[PDB]
Amino acid sequence: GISRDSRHKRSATGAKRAQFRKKRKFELGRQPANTKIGAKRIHSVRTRGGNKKYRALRIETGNFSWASEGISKKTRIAGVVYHPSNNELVRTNTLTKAAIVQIDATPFRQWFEAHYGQTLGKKSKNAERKWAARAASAKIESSVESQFSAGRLYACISSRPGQSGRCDGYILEGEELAFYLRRLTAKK
């Protein structure tokens, strides 16, 4: 199958190298998960030494954390919009690490307005206490508050779907969000 040996390949001098031994399984490679969006489908691959690796091909929910907020929700993945490696991953909406995706917002909105009682965009007792205890601390961020109105949030996939079977990520924020925002329109 796919060999990962170096022993094909020209020597740094530019020299051609002879074949010494056949392919060994311990230098083997496998094919890309090329995971897509929707309706959970995951196959296990038996890797070296016993040991499973989970090949997610097709996924519709991932676990996504709002770093600055210290929480993480599970959401639908609306999905893909920018990829640094290869633009066909975007057009095909393919899921890989570093993929910029859009997720769902609604689980983060429900949390925030429950936690801050402030509502984005545009009477219990101790709850009142906690809300008033917070704020001067609820001051979100322009380019994130605006995303909630569209019910869709930008997020950078940070797991490895073809290895772990999870499509997890974080919400974009600050300079990093600024960055992909700029590309996102300086190409749209």
Partner: protein
Amino acid sequence: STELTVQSERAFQKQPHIFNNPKVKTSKRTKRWYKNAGLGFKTPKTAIEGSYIDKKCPFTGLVSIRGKILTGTVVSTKMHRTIVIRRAYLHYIPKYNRYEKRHKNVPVHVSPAFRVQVGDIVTVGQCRPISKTVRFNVVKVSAAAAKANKQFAKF
């Protein structure tokens, strides 16, 4: 090498898991991480003062120096962020009881913390494979410029 831009890739260049919370208003924009490589190699100040990214940087990146220590003399700085040094060495032949000049070129990574030019003597430190040919990463400049500014105009 680097120079300018720093945010000049398709992917946003960042140091892993070094979060800056936008809620907390800061006076330095970006929190920066570094270490000392050990073996009493001073992490130079351009590494800390800097804003370059290089995850193969011995001081600001995710490599470690372990193994060998080599000091070559730099013979090519054409590759962005990597150099080739000539290891200066000398080799005995018993039958004739004399020696014969030999050399070996070595490719080494070079952090934007360093600013190397051809001619410099350079101490390099071994690390994990970093590329097809590079198993070494600069770490310290024993040189400077090799009498460059001492060659200006007339009186």
